[PDB]
Amino acid sequence: DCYHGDGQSYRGTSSTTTTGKKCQSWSSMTPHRHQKTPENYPNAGLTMNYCRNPDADKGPWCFTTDPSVRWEYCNLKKC
Template sequence: CQRWDSQSPHSHPHTPQAHPDAGLKENFCRNPDNKERPWCYTTDPTWRWDYCDVMEC
């Protein structure tokens, strides 16, 4: 996953500053916009984002 505080390789609006209560730290999978499940921007320039394979709490 791409770090949430990084704009490379994908620029995006989901930054820790824009969403201070969303826990957007490091490159951890999160769900800041209430998608189906946690996701992250990828480090692959050709694949913008993907869902994460994590267990539901």
């Protein structure tokens, strides 16, 4: 659907970036290793590969499943 404000409260099912790439799961370290895991960000709703905003950036984002592109913003409109 959409997100409000900076989308740190977004708990949707969206999981595709702005360029149509599929998001990587927050609990996997492949293809990109990272520290934005549910253990490090317990209140961010980090589940499956859904778009989220653990670091309080401008809007929901995800690590991508393309080995060449670490992360991008998600394909979501601002409510």
